[PDB]
């Protein structure tokens, strides 16, 4: 029935988990370290917070053209 006590003790679990868990950890590490998190989720880099034109907190101030405007005042 595998009541979660025998599987954790068995080596069959840890043979296939000595690769999957470290590979996922390394995948997350590279996902952060390659800038892919910034590119995918749109968070600005520490050097990409203030553009030369605006030096204050950005404001969306529009609804139906919000996509075009956020493309305008984002970090290019």
């Amino acid at each position: 029935e595998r009541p979660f006590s025998d599987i954790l003790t068995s080596i069959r679990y840890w043979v296939i988990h000595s690769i999957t868990v470290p590979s996922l950890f390394i995948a997350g590490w590279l996902f952060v370290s390659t800038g892919l998190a910034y590119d995918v989720f749109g968070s600005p880099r520490p050097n990409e917070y203030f553009t030369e034109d605006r030096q204050d907190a950005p404001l969306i101030t529009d609804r139906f053209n919000a996509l075009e405007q956020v493309k305008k005042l984002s970090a290019q």
Partner: protein, 348 residues
Amino acid sequence: IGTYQEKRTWFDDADDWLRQDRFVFVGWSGLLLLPCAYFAVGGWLTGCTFVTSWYTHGLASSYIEGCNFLTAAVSTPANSLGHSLLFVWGPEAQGDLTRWFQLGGLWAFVALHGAFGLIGFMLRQFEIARSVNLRPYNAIAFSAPIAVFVSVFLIYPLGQSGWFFAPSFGVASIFRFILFFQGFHNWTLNPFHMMGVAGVLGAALLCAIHGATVENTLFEDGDGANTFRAFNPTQAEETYSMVTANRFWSQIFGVAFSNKRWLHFFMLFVPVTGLWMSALGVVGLALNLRAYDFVSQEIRAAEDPEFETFYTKNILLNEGIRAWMAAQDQPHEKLTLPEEVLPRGNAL
């Protein structure tokens, strides 16, 4: 059903598969609860980790920017977006995911999926109670968290200017929301909120008292020093002395419970009633119908420079919360107020 032939269809097979004992129960409600709840928790954990709030609120609320667990949050959209549902395909995002994250659409995603997950969860409570043939008092009790969630995350922002004034999904975000209700609504002075506070405090009191009383009337039921192994689910006798408990609390407090029915119904009743009263109060606050002032007190203090109460002190504190919080709280309002018009006491 009801002594009929009832030729089988696809529904009978689907019901037989869904209503089976497993590691996790699925049921028909799992067609909604499992995806909606998984997406709500995953979206919250993703927004707290990667999705920024620099565009909408002008602040950092994610782990990629330097925020803690108590600090990062899934922030609400901008007030200029109003009550837009903020779909990915909607006119705001226009099918662009990386700008949909930047536009605060993840808050609407998490909120709608959490609401439907709560719906699916209390449906699951109904389905499991029907499978085990028990009354759905768990669902009746869970109706109050659903009411609180609906009134707080839906009804209040729909009454206000937009989703921007809704609670952002986080810790410091919720603290901001709480202080905003203190400064702008005088939420402590609201009798519905007072009823909710009484309900929660009385429910915690009931939990502690009931647990301590049962654990201190546990009977012998064994010879070892650990009473926990003295319990047997097979036996048909009560594990604690209700007569002894009743006499103890009658001579300590004056009143005591004599019915386990009434004791546990009261334990169910107090927090549900408190949370429902608080939900009604937040609904009242959704339209700024707040119990902010006492007219007699304010007229008395207006015509009397001597008359002061702690309520007047609270009113003065709320004024400072509003004045010193609005400029950095609402960037849409563009409140560039100078420091001299902001109120100050002496020397601080």
